[PDB]
Design a protein around this nucleic acid. Structure first.
Length: 96
RNA sequence: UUAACAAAAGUAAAUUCCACUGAAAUGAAUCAAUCAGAGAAGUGGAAUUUAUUGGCUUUGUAAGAAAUUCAAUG
């Protein structure tokens, strides 16, 4: 069903604010800026387990992206790969 | 001109890690390459290697030695 969230993460790039990177995602979960976490399908199972446990503590929803980190980076209009992603605010979409 | 073994005034090259921050107008770099959101470059650090301690100069050793001269041992 990857004709949805892919288009959802296109208005966020235009109006909303997200942050790319596992280290930078963990920074936002520690604060209150995180409102949603998207994890690719190939994130290492040990670093993935640390994001979810952090999100469970922070009560932030985790969206298991159906593509790899290469596909997730392209979904944000980026020429590198993104493993984890945090949404500070949804611009015009309905992701949150 | 200077040894083994040790010292630590001064000071190198290369690689790998750590902290801050988060790269797109993509940058960084080599003779060649090669690398980066499971995170580049920047700044500040840590470690190891470099014919023994710690690589080079320097120092103790150690000038009393040795080399080159002079005089009839100095």
């Amino acid at each position: 069903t990857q004709e949805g969230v892919n288009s959802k993460l296109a208005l966020v790039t235009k109006s909303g604010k997200y942050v790319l990177g596992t280290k930078a995602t963990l920074k936002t979960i520690r604060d209150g800026k995180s409102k949603l976490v998207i994890i690719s399908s190939n994130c290492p199972p040990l670093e993935r387990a640390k994001i979810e446990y952090y999100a469970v503590l922070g009560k932030v929803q985790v969206v298991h992206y159906s593509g790899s980190n290469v596909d997730l980076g392209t979904a944000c209009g980026r020429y590198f790969s993104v493993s984890v992603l945090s949404i500070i605010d949804g611009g015009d979409s309905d992701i949150l």
